[PDB]
Design a protein around this motif. Sequence first.
Motif, PDB file in Angstrom:
ATOM      1  N   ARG A  88      41.062   8.690 -13.826  1.00  0.00           N
ATOM      2  CA  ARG A  88      41.215   8.218 -15.237  1.00  0.00           C
ATOM      3  C   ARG A  88      40.272   7.080 -15.574  1.00  0.00           C
ATOM      4  NH1 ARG A  88      47.622   7.723 -15.451  1.00  0.00           N
ATOM      5  NH2 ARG A  88      47.210   7.200 -13.247  1.00  0.00           N
ATOM      6  N   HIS A  89      39.868   6.279 -14.604  1.00  0.00           N
ATOM      7  CA  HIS A  89      38.947   5.153 -14.872  1.00  0.00           C
ATOM      8  C   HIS A  89      37.530   5.619 -15.221  1.00  0.00           C
ATOM      9  CE1 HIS A  89      38.944   6.001 -10.622  1.00  0.00           C
ATOM     10  NE2 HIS A  89      37.761   5.418 -10.514  1.00  0.00           N
ATOM     11  N   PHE A  90      37.220   6.925 -15.095  1.00  0.00           N
ATOM     12  CA  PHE A  90      35.931   7.520 -15.534  1.00  0.00           C
ATOM     13  C   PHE A  90      35.992   8.073 -16.952  1.00  0.00           C
ATOM     14  CE2 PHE A  90      35.326   8.651 -10.757  1.00  0.00           C
ATOM     15  CZ  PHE A  90      34.735   7.454 -10.468  1.00  0.00           C
ATOM     16  N   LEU A  91      37.143   7.976 -17.629  1.00  0.00           N
ATOM     17  CA  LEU A  91      37.309   8.575 -18.977  1.00  0.00           C
ATOM     18  C   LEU A  91      36.928   7.515 -20.006  1.00  0.00           C
ATOM     19  CD1 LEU A  91      40.765  10.294 -18.444  1.00  0.00           C
ATOM     20  CD2 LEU A  91      38.483  11.370 -18.393  1.00  0.00           C
ATOM     21  N   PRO A  92      36.174   7.912 -21.039  1.00  0.00           N
ATOM     22  CA  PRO A  92      35.857   6.990 -22.118  1.00  0.00           C
ATOM     23  C   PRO A  92      37.083   6.627 -22.918  1.00  0.00           C
ATOM     24  CG  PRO A  92      34.818   9.150 -22.528  1.00  0.00           C
ATOM     25  CD  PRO A  92      35.554   9.225 -21.211  1.00  0.00           C
ATOM     26  N   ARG A  93      37.041   5.439 -23.526  1.00  0.00           N
ATOM     27  CA  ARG A  93      38.177   4.985 -24.351  1.00  0.00           C
ATOM     28  C   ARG A  93      38.004   5.426 -25.799  1.00  0.00           C
ATOM     29  NH1 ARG A  93      40.672  -0.219 -21.466  1.00  0.00           N
ATOM     30  NH2 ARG A  93      41.238   0.930 -19.572  1.00  0.00           N
ATOM     31  N   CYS A  94      36.770   5.639 -26.248  1.00  0.00           N
ATOM     32  CA  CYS A  94      36.528   5.960 -27.682  1.00  0.00           C
ATOM     33  C   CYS A  94      35.596   7.162 -27.831  1.00  0.00           C
ATOM     34  CB  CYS A  94      35.937   4.763 -28.420  1.00  0.00           C
ATOM     35  SG  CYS A  94      34.343   4.235 -27.749  1.00  0.00           S
ATOM     36  N   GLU A  95      35.560   7.715 -29.041  1.00  0.00           N
ATOM     37  CA  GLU A  95      34.603   8.765 -29.429  1.00  0.00           C
ATOM     38  C   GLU A  95      33.203   8.152 -29.403  1.00  0.00           C
ATOM     39  OE1 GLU A  95      35.665  10.655 -33.131  1.00  0.00           O
ATOM     40  OE2 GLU A  95      37.844  10.407 -32.760  1.00  0.00           O
ATOM     41  N   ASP A  96      32.224   8.878 -28.906  1.00  0.00           N
ATOM     42  CA  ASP A  96      30.866   8.344 -28.724  1.00  0.00           C
ATOM     43  C   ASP A  96      29.851   9.474 -28.589  1.00  0.00           C
ATOM     44  OD1 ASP A  96      29.013   6.209 -28.440  1.00  0.00           O
ATOM     45  OD2 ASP A  96      29.984   5.436 -26.624  1.00  0.00           O
ATOM     46  N   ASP A  97      28.579   9.114 -28.700  1.00  0.00           N
ATOM     47  CA  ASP A  97      27.404   9.935 -28.362  1.00  0.00           C
ATOM     48  C   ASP A  97      26.923   9.509 -26.967  1.00  0.00           C
ATOM     49  OD1 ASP A  97      26.765  10.956 -31.319  1.00  0.00           O
ATOM     50  OD2 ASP A  97      26.531   8.806 -31.500  1.00  0.00           O
ATOM     51  N   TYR A  98      26.220  10.412 -26.270  1.00  0.00           N
ATOM     52  CA  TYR A  98      25.772  10.187 -24.879  1.00  0.00           C
ATOM     53  C   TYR A  98      24.357  10.691 -24.677  1.00  0.00           C
ATOM     54  CZ  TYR A  98      30.745   9.180 -24.228  1.00  0.00           C
ATOM     55  OH  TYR A  98      31.998   8.690 -24.412  1.00  0.00           O
ATOM     56  N   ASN A  99      23.674  10.069 -23.720  1.00  0.00           N
ATOM     57  CA  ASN A  99      22.406  10.631 -23.196  1.00  0.00           C
ATOM     58  C   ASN A  99      22.618  11.319 -21.831  1.00  0.00           C
ATOM     59  OD1 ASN A  99      20.907   9.435 -25.412  1.00  0.00           O
ATOM     60  ND2 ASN A  99      21.056   7.484 -24.299  1.00  0.00           N
ATOM     61  N   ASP A 100      21.801  12.330 -21.582  1.00  0.00           N
ATOM     62  CA  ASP A 100      21.496  12.877 -20.255  1.00  0.00           C
ATOM     63  C   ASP A 100      22.796  13.335 -19.597  1.00  0.00           C
ATOM     64  OD1 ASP A 100      19.789  13.489 -18.119  1.00  0.00           O
ATOM     65  OD2 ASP A 100      20.048  11.518 -17.193  1.00  0.00           O
ATOM     66  N   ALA A 101      23.470  14.299 -20.202  1.00  0.00           N
ATOM     67  CA  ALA A 101      24.741  14.840 -19.652  1.00  0.00           C
ATOM     68  C   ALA A 101      24.473  16.070 -18.803  1.00  0.00           C
ATOM     69  CB  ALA A 101      25.702  15.141 -20.778  1.00  0.00           C
ATOM     70  N   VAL A 102      25.412  16.360 -17.913  1.00  0.00           N
ATOM     71  CA  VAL A 102      25.435  17.561 -17.041  1.00  0.00           C
ATOM     72  C   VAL A 102      26.697  18.334 -17.358  1.00  0.00           C
ATOM     73  CG1 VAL A 102      25.616  18.376 -14.678  1.00  0.00           C
ATOM     74  CG2 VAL A 102      24.063  16.487 -15.250  1.00  0.00           C
ATOM     75  N   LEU A 103      26.592  19.645 -17.485  1.00  0.00           N
ATOM     76  CA  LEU A 103      27.731  20.603 -17.554  1.00  0.00           C
ATOM     77  C   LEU A 103      27.856  21.311 -16.224  1.00  0.00           C
ATOM     78  CD1 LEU A 103      29.882  22.308 -19.070  1.00  0.00           C
ATOM     79  CD2 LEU A 103      27.990  23.689 -19.914  1.00  0.00           C
ATOM     80  N   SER A 104      29.013  21.190 -15.560  1.00  0.00           N
ATOM     81  CA  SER A 104      29.237  21.762 -14.208  1.00  0.00           C
ATOM     82  C   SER A 104      30.406  22.754 -14.223  1.00  0.00           C
ATOM     83  CB  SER A 104      29.397  20.689 -13.136  1.00  0.00           C
ATOM     84  OG  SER A 104      30.321  19.672 -13.513  1.00  0.00           O
ATOM     85  N   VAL A 105      30.188  23.937 -13.648  1.00  0.00           N
ATOM     86  CA  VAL A 105      31.122  25.086 -13.677  1.00  0.00           C
ATOM     87  C   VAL A 105      31.340  25.562 -12.268  1.00  0.00           C
ATOM     88  CG1 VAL A 105      31.219  27.515 -14.409  1.00  0.00           C
ATOM     89  CG2 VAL A 105      30.351  25.742 -15.992  1.00  0.00           C
ATOM     90  N   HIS A 106      32.588  25.929 -11.936  1.00  0.00           N
ATOM     91  CA  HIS A 106      32.862  26.562 -10.648  1.00  0.00           C
ATOM     92  C   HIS A 106      33.891  27.671 -10.838  1.00  0.00           C
ATOM     93  CE1 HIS A 106      32.539  26.871  -6.323  1.00  0.00           C
ATOM     94  NE2 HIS A 106      33.898  27.095  -6.370  1.00  0.00           N
ATOM     95  N   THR A 107      33.424  28.922 -10.835  1.00  0.00           N
ATOM     96  CA  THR A 107      34.323  30.105 -10.914  1.00  0.00           C
ATOM     97  C   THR A 107      33.833  31.120  -9.894  1.00  0.00           C
ATOM     98  OG1 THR A 107      33.043  31.206 -12.586  1.00  0.00           O
ATOM     99  CG2 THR A 107      34.708  29.631 -13.376  1.00  0.00           C
ATOM    100  N   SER A 108      34.549  32.245  -9.754  1.00  0.00           N
ATOM    101  CA  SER A 108      34.044  33.468  -9.041  1.00  0.00           C
ATOM    102  C   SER A 108      32.699  33.944  -9.626  1.00  0.00           C
ATOM    103  CB  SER A 108      35.119  34.579  -9.122  1.00  0.00           C
ATOM    104  OG  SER A 108      36.290  34.115  -8.434  1.00  0.00           O
ATOM    105  N   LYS A 109      32.525  33.946 -10.931  1.00  0.00           N
ATOM    106  CA  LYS A 109      31.300  34.452 -11.608  1.00  0.00           C
ATOM    107  C   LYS A 109      30.154  33.443 -11.412  1.00  0.00           C
ATOM    108  CE  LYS A 109      29.737  36.391 -16.016  1.00  0.00           C
ATOM    109  NZ  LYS A 109      30.193  36.668 -17.398  1.00  0.00           N
ATOM    110  N   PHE A 110      30.462  32.153 -11.519  1.00  0.00           N
ATOM    111  CA  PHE A 110      29.437  31.078 -11.467  1.00  0.00           C
ATOM    112  C   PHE A 110      29.859  29.981 -10.495  1.00  0.00           C
ATOM    113  CE2 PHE A 110      28.421  32.429 -16.071  1.00  0.00           C
ATOM    114  CZ  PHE A 110      27.274  33.104 -15.712  1.00  0.00           C
ATOM    115  N   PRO A 111      29.728  30.145  -9.163  1.00  0.00           N
ATOM    116  CA  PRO A 111      30.033  29.077  -8.220  1.00  0.00           C
ATOM    117  C   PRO A 111      28.915  28.036  -8.175  1.00  0.00           C
ATOM    118  CG  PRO A 111      29.529  31.053  -6.996  1.00  0.00           C
ATOM    119  CD  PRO A 111      29.448  31.425  -8.456  1.00  0.00           C
TER     120      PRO A 111
END
Length: 182
Positions: A88-111
């Motif tokens: 929980r200490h990695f969660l933002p407190r407010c709505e915001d814009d961000y730079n340089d984000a990563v989207l990470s997925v782990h399924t049977s289709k996309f490990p």
Amino acid sequence: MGPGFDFAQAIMKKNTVIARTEKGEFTMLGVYDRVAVIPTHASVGEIIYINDVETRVLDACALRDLTDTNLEITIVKLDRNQKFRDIRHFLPRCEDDYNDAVLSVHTSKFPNMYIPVGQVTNYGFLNLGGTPTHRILMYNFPTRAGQCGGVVTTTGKVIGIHVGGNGAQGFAAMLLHSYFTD
């Protein structure tokens, strides 16, 4: 490959499970204790599969803002015999814009899938599959089916879960610290 990918991997390796409902397989982020999140369109019921094991759902709450608008986040408490690392200490407190984000997925289709999506906009309102939705983040990456529930991170923050796309843009629901006070 770099420090953004390092943070993202550290979250995937300890704070994700593969969730299966009648509506598909999803990346599911564990936040603390036996509490996890999943897109509301997963339609979580009384039973869910967690890493292919039948698991009772103790509680499921589809979040809405105080205007009674969909936020596309369902908070699930799982009848699991193990707790998640508390992030929980990695969660933002407010709505915001961000730079340089990563989207990470782990399924049977996309490990073990990681995508550098770049700049993330506080988009706000989105008509998502016909449903008015609030607190939407946008990135200019051509996301595809199978990525829903994927975790959006920057260095040091877990900021959202992927909920949809239009072919050219991807959309995530915000995660806020206030959703997980106990």
